[PDB]
Design a binder for this molecule. Structure first.
Ligand SMILES: *[C@@H]1O[C@H](CO)[C@@H](O[C@@H]2O[C@H](CO)[C@@H](O)[C@H](O)[C@H]2NC(C)=O)[C@H](O)[C@H]1NC(C)=O
Ligand SMILES: *[C@@H]1O[C@H](CO)[C@@H](O[C@@H]2O[C@H](CO)[C@@H](O)[C@H](O)[C@H]2NC(C)=O)[C@H](O)[C@H]1NC(C)=O
Ligand SMILES: *[C@@H]1O[C@H](CO)[C@@H](O[C@@H]2O[C@H](CO)[C@@H](O)[C@H](O)[C@H]2NC(C)=O)[C@H](O)[C@H]1NC(C)=O
Ligand SMILES: *[C@@H]1O[C@H](CO)[C@@H](O[C@@H]2O[C@H](CO)[C@@H](O)[C@H](O)[C@H]2NC(C)=O)[C@H](O)[C@H]1NC(C)=O
Ligand SMILES: *[C@@H]1O[C@H](CO)[C@@H](O)[C@H](O)[C@H]1NC(C)=O
Ligand SMILES: *[C@@H]1O[C@H](CO)[C@@H](O)[C@H](O)[C@H]1NC(C)=O
Ligand SMILES: *[C@@H]1O[C@H](CO)[C@@H](O)[C@H](O)[C@H]1NC(C)=O
Ligand SMILES: *[C@@H]1O[C@H](CO)[C@@H](O)[C@H](O)[C@H]1NC(C)=O
Ligand SMILES: *[C@@H]1O[C@H](CO)[C@@H](O)[C@H](O)[C@H]1NC(C)=O
Ligand SMILES: *[C@@H]1O[C@H](CO)[C@@H](O)[C@H](O)[C@H]1NC(C)=O
Ligand SMILES: *[C@@H]1O[C@H](CO)[C@@H](O)[C@H](O)[C@H]1NC(C)=O
Ligand SMILES: *[C@@H]1O[C@H](CO)[C@@H](O)[C@H](O)[C@H]1NC(C)=O
Ligand SMILES: *[C@@H]1O[C@H](CO)[C@@H](O)[C@H](O)[C@H]1NC(C)=O
Ligand SMILES: *[C@@H]1O[C@H](CO)[C@@H](O)[C@H](O)[C@H]1NC(C)=O
Ligand SMILES: *[C@@H]1O[C@H](CO)[C@@H](O)[C@H](O)[C@H]1NC(C)=O
Lengths: 427, 387, 237, 147
């Protein structure tokens, strides 16, 4: 039907992809972590720092020995695209049937006395069978059996004191219901599965907040300003336009946020300049039609857009050629409601037909085309006021007019259980 | 204040003077027209999110239909208050009007605008396009309005400009001052202004010789009351509180809707790009559905409260249309409907989103005690007064 | 002895740049107008608790205050922590020390702090007009430290304005802390000026300026007026 | 058109409510029978709770918008009852309340869901210019017209 319709939105599309990783070329020492002759016992677990490297993660999970590759705040497919902060690695040996205790929220004497993970853990847990390397006899793999209380997350308790399991205070030497707290492991090569030793590595990191030194194999591109790009800064993706900023970041800061918690500023990782981020231009599109009874011609309003910026405001020559005629031409008119394209501006005033806004209306007139004009308020008139003149009527008209008012509406009812559940008694 | 009437069964009090009084009434007419791009609010530019949003149905078609229905009604409100006569009556030269001085409410005739002096004072007292256009200098473009536009929230302009609304009010003023109430019923019939004022005195039960004998005093009292309106609007703070409240409530609702985008609603992040950077789609879908459900709830709350505010604004504009018809285009007998006292005449002035009425009334002033009687007996017959 | 904080121990709670907004944060903070314990050397170091975290401030002119020990028993049965300045570098160390019953440092002179230092798991090394402020926290196997230095304008009392502490270092030590003791630089080596406040779980309302600087705050549990300002999310009512 | 709008808005609201039943709201199906044919109750509960929550939200939206439309229809019926009283059962002096011109009388006619008023008014027609005066002096006394 004849009218004006908000139908969709235009939006400039990005052209190319940008990657800006830091410039680091030395690889990352995972051989020193995963191929070591002697791992540590679980009560005294080792923590190794990992820093200033390029770490390729796919050769870990695309290998054979690991019977556990459990990641927690992240997917394994994504690990080669992110940059990491405060990377640490933790290594020990446990029994074969308590790998399930190395997880957030676990009970058991390993999780309660020896090595505790937090609830909001971010990282990966890797485990594999080491029967060939740690079984013969072997007894210097100890675990803790007795503590006064439960451990905190990432707490290590390396201390020797005789465990008072009675009401009498012992000292120094073993006694009755007084116990040495540590206990060895019986790793024999003919043990069943569940008693055979397993080697465990725990990686833990932080993602996308602070500056980063450890990240995977991506090749950078060059920084492209002043146009709608598809960026990737240290693993943080998004679409927008990059321009130079003049905010000053303190050296522990990599990103800025606005009131809606979106990223709107970034420090480059090769240059150390500050850039601003802003989405590529969009807006509403209204279509002015007469009836499809009468025509198939239309005019198009781009709401709150300047007219010389409309092919900048749309993604210029990506649209259909049937579409791109409605971004240029000679029927281009600037109003305060945006840019109108496809109607001829005339200089008369008429009573309003299809409202556009800020004083402008549109119509279909005689061949036939769509016109745009300023609406008229009414007919000009002037009263012949004087200080001793009056006008008196000498005839009259009897007039009858109609007035229509709504009184009532349709009464409806809803059977709720039939709407929600049908006939189903389970529902 | 405590007071006590000296009632008796044969005493009456009659006034011996009067005061010409001018008072102000302010009414809201319209509110800001807004629009929402739903997919840009909920999903940003993420096509994964916008494909998941199709599972919830026609919710955003429904929300945009409700907001479009509000925006059309806001132009109907303004048409109903201001466009009641279809002749544009031209401002006469002001040198007669029997001593009554209308210069501060009529449009300034050397300037090319149509606003009067009091309309200029009213338009400088409410603290309310191309700031969507700039939004890219990216340090000075940290306004609240660029944060709204980047998340799909826009403001639509009104159909009538402020200059058009001032033209309508000056045509109503010219019709009233040159013709009385005849242009509201048909063609305008000219009458001199002191004869118009005499017939309005006759309408409140005072004989017209009272007007003609006190003409200069009545015109001086009127000109003084107009000056008091003008300097009370040049020296106050919050006379237009009813119009400032509509602006404040609208800006508050849009800012609340923008700040709701930093809730995670039980997800691991409130930023969609962080979730898409760290997870693959089978377990990303679980977090994105939580964010979609929270943001849909926020939009539905905003739209429900806009519809309720639009119904109260509509009742206020119906009352302003009735007051234009019954106090500017006629003389009214309804007690207190056009000010306090006996109504003589009213003048309209445009205001941002609103209308101000200046009501002129007769207030009795200086009373005396007399002895009274119901009838008089003369020749064995009772005599009663006619008027 | 006691003094009054007025505004002490507000730090940047995260690492993201924010300009010209307001922001509400739950952390461990030092409450406003609380009593800080005073220690002076008019001419003493006991074992103060830790409990949830510590505000530490200190003021001298010529490098007397140097480092702390943190632990549980201080008796070589459990692990413990040590931080010392050399006036060139800083030494941080998580061995299983047997500590002396009165640790200090003789004036260059030798160390009279620990006799035995076995069983080490961590080691690190790094680099009145001086008020040095510190916040210590021990959460999730980490030891966080915030700091800032300013020229004190005064004689003995703490200054009145507002200044926020930047983050310094985060240490993965994995130990249990319940007590601590500061380490001085004593001239006459006798093997036998600083303020301490405690951190509380609060809610604060932080104001960031045009340049990204925290210039003002509101402690929401101080008084009913500030409890009003935290509900209204502004600074004027 | 004012009466056709009330019919159209309510048919549109009921059709929207009917076609909201083909959304799955994040479940594996929007058809409850297809969910109950393929799964057993312990993991069928998870999908049926999603469908229940979505359909409950649709019904709540329909009812809230009906209550706001009923309030506007109530204000329109109050105005029509006042016009019946003041224009059909009396003669009115309120300017423009019973048509345009000076009101003589009004007639009511019934309409579907509504009411139509036929207002009869007097409109002055053919005007002449005259010279006028406020008073007339006769014997050193001022005379004023009565009506
Ligand atoms: C951290 O160390 C403290 C200090 O010893 C431990 O807390 C003590 O536990 C005993 C157990 O009977 C209590 O009697 C003491 O009162 C506690 N002292 C304090 C200061 O709280 C605590 O158990 C250790 N943490 C963990 C997780 O074991
Ligand atoms: C007042 O107006 C009416 C029009 O309604 C005039 O009536 C017309 O008079 C002429 C001359 O006699 C006839 O030819 C027309 O047919 C009449 N029209 C109608 C509708 O009856 C009437 O003459 C006018 N009166 C004056 C004094 O001018
Ligand atoms: C009625 O009230 C008016 C007040 O408006 C009186 O007018 C004043 O008269 C005195 C004496 O002549 C003058 O000095 C004042 O300047 C007048 N005031 C104004 C505003 O003009 C008038 O006298 C009163 N009439 C009666 C009969 O009491
Ligand atoms: C009608 O009132 C206005 C008040 O605004 C008078 O205009 C002012 O006249 C004074 C001189 O007495 C000037 O100093 C002002 O600049 C004028 N103001 C404006 C806005 O022009 C005006 O003179 C009065 N008209 C008559 C006929 O007395
Ligand atoms: C550990 O050694 C195995 C066998 O030689 C090898 O496949 C693997 O890549 C090594 N791990 C590293 C280098 O991280
Ligand atoms: C490498 O990084 C340094 C320090 O950030 C920077 O100065 C230099 O320009 C970078 N070089 C390249 C080729 O990116
Ligand atoms: C369109 O217009 C034609 C011509 O008036 C008419 O015959 C036809 O019924 C119309 N169709 C609709 C759907 O209004
Ligand atoms: C569009 O841009 C031109 C060039 O700066 C400017 O002159 C014009 O005023 C702009 N249009 C609007 C509506 O601001
Ligand atoms: C309308 O008039 C202006 C001058 O007032 C002129 O510049 C313009 O070209 C005219 N447009 C048409 C369509 O006549
Ligand atoms: C009329 O008389 C009463 C009683 O003496 C007096 O109180 C009252 O004020 C008088 N009214 C006037 C208007 O003087
Ligand atoms: C802090 O010191 C003041 C000194 O006036 C004292 O009244 C107050 O009780 C002290 N507060 C605490 C918690 O000890
Ligand atoms: C600081 O002094 C201690 C003790 O002499 C020493 O162990 C440490 O290496 C020194 N730090 C340096 C030289 O950076
Ligand atoms: C540290 O470990 C050794 C064995 O490497 C052990 O003999 C010693 O007792 C431990 N230190 C302490 C203080 O217990
Ligand atoms: C913000 O930083 C600028 C430096 O460009 C400085 O001139 C200005 O004083 C600072 N603003 C405030 C409020 O301190
Ligand atoms: C009255 O006189 C004026 C001035 O000559 C004229 O313009 C006007 O049309 C006349 N009115 C009528 C009703 O003839």
């Amino acid at each position: 039907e004849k009218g004006i319709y908000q139908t969709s939105n235009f939006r400039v599309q990005p052209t190319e992809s940008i990657v800006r990783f830091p410039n680091i070329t030395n690889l990352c020492p995972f051989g020193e972590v995963f191929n070591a002759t002697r791992f540590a016992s679980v009560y005294a677990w080792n923590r190794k720092r990992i820093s200033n490297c390029v770490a390729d993660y796919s050769v870990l999970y695309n290998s054979a020995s690991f019977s556990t590759f459990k990641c927690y705040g992240v997917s394994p497919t994504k690990l080669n695209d992110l940059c990491f902060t405060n990377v640490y690695a933790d290594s020990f040996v446990i029994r074969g049937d308590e790998v399930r205790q190395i997880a957030p929220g676990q009970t058991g004497k390993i999780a309660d006395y020896n090595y505790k993970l937090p609830d909001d853990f971010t990282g990966c847990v890797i485990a594999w069978n080491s029967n060939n390397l740690d079984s013969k006899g072997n007894y210097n793999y100890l675990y803790r059996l007795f503590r006064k209380s439960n451990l905190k997350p990432f707490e290590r308790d390396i201390s020797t004191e005789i465990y008072q399991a009675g009401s009498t205070p012992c000292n120094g030497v073993e006694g009755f219901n007084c116990y040495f707290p540590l206990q060895s492991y019986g790793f024999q090569p003919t043990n069943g599965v569940g008693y055979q030793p397993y080697r465990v590595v725990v990686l833990s990191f932080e993602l996308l907040h602070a500056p980063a030194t450890v990240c995977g194999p991506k090749k950078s591109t060059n920084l492209v300003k002043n146009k709608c790009v598809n960026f990737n800064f240290n693993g943080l993706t998004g679409t927008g336009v990059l321009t130079e900023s003049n905010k000053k970041f303190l050296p522990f800061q990599q990103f800025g946020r606005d009131i809606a918690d979106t990223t709107d500023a970034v420090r480059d990782p090769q240059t150390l300049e500050i850039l601003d981020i802003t989405p590529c231009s969009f807006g509403g599109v209204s279509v002015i039609t007469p009836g499809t009874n009468t025509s198939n011609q239309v005019a198009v309003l781009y709401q709150d857009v300047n007219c010389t910026e409309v092919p900048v405001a749309i993604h210029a020559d990506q649209l259909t050629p049937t579409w791109r005629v409605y971004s240029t031409g000679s029927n281009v008119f600037q109003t305060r409601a945006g840019c109108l394209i496809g109607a001829e501006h005339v200089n008369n005033s008429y009573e309003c037909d299809i409202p556009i806004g800020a004083g402008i209306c549109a119509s279909y007139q005689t061949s036939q085309s769509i016109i745009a004009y300023t609406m008229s308020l009414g007919a000009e008139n002037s009263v012949a006021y004087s200080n001793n003149s009056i006008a008196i009527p000498t005839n009259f008209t009897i007039s009858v007019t109609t007035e229509i008012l709504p009184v009532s509406m349709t009464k409806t009812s809803v059977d709720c259980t039939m709407y929600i559940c049908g006939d189903s008694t389970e529902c | 204040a405590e007071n006590s009437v000296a009632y008796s069964n044969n005493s009456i009090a009659i006034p011996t003077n009067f005061t010409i009084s001018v008072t102000t009434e302010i009414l809201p007419v319209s509110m800001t027209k807004t629009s929402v791009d739903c997919t840009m609010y909920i999903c940003g530019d993420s096509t994964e999110c916008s494909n998941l949003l199709l599972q919830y149905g026609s919710f955003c078609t429904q929300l945009n239909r409700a907001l479009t229905g509000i925006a059309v009604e806001q132009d109907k409100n303004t048409q109903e208050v201001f466009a009641q006569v279809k002749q544009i009556y031209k401002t006469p030269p002001i040198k007669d009007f029997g001593g009554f001085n209308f210069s501060q409410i009529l449009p300034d005739p050397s300037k090319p605008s149509k606003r009067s002096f009091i309309e200029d004072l009213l338009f400088n007292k409410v603290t309310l396009i191309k700031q969507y256009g700039d939004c890219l200098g990216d340090i000075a473009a940290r306004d609240l309005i660029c944060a709204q536009k980047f998340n799909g929230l826009t403001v639509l302009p009104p159909l009538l400009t402020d200059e058009m609304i001032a033209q309508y009010t000056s045509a109503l003023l010219a019709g009233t001052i040159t013709s009385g109430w005849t242009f509201g019923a048909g063609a305008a019939l000219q009458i001199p202004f002191a004869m118009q004022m005499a017939y309005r005195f006759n309408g409140i039960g005072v004989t017209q010789n009272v007007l003609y004998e006190n003409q200069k005093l009545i015109a001086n009292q009127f000109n003084s009351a107009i000056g008091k309106i003008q300097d009370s609007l040049s020296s106050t703070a919050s006379a237009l509180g009813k119009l400032q409240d509509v602006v404040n409530q609208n800006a508050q609702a849009l800012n609340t809707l923008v700040k709701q985008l930093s809730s995670n609603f039980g997800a691991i992040s409130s930023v969609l790009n962080d979730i898409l950077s760290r997870l693959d789609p089978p377990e990303a879908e679980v977090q994105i559905d939580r964010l979609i459900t929270g943001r849909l709830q926020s939009l539905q709350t905003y739209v429900t409260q806009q519809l309720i505010r639009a119904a109260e604004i509509r009742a206020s504009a119906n009352l302003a249309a009735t007051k234009m018809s019954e106090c500017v285009l006629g003389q009214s007998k309804r007690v207190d409907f056009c000010g306090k006292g006996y109504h003589l005449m009213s003048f309209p002035q445009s205001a941002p989103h609103g209308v101000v009425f200046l009501h002129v009334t007769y207030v009795p002033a200086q009373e005396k005690n007399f002895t009274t009687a119901p009838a008089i007996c003369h020749d064995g017959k009772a005599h009663f007064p006619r008027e | 002895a006691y003094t009054n904080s007025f505004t002490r121990g507000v730090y940047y709670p995260d690492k993201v740049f924010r300009s010209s907004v307001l922001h509400s944060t739950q952390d461990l903070f030092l409450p406003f107008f609380s009593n800080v314990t005073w220690f002076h050397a008019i001419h003493d170091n006991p074992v103060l608790p830790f409990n949830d975290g510590v505000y530490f401030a200190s003021t001298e002119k010529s490098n007397i205050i140097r480092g702390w020990i943190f632990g549980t028993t201080l008796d070589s049965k459990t692990q413990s922590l040590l931080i010392v300045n050399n006036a060139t570098n800083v030494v941080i160390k998580v061995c299983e020390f047997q500590f002396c019953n009165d640790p200090f440092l003789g004036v260059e002179s030798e160390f009279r702090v620990y006799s035995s230092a076995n069983n080490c798991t961590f080691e690190y090394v790094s680099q009145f007009k001086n008020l040095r402020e510190f916040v210590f926290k021990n959460i999730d196997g980490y030891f966080k430290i915030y700091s800032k230095h300013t020229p004190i304008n005064l004689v003995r009392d703490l200054p009145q304005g507002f200044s926020a502490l930047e983050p310094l270092v985060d240490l993965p030590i994995g130990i249990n802390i319940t007590r601590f003791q500061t380490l001085l630089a004593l001239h006459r080596s006798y093997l036998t000026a600083y303020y301490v406040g405690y951190l509380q779980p609060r809610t604060f309302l932080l104001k960031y300026n045009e340049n990204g600087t925290i210039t003002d705050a509101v402690d929401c549990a101080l008084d009913p007026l500030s409890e009003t300002k935290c509900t209204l999310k502004s600074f004027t009512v």
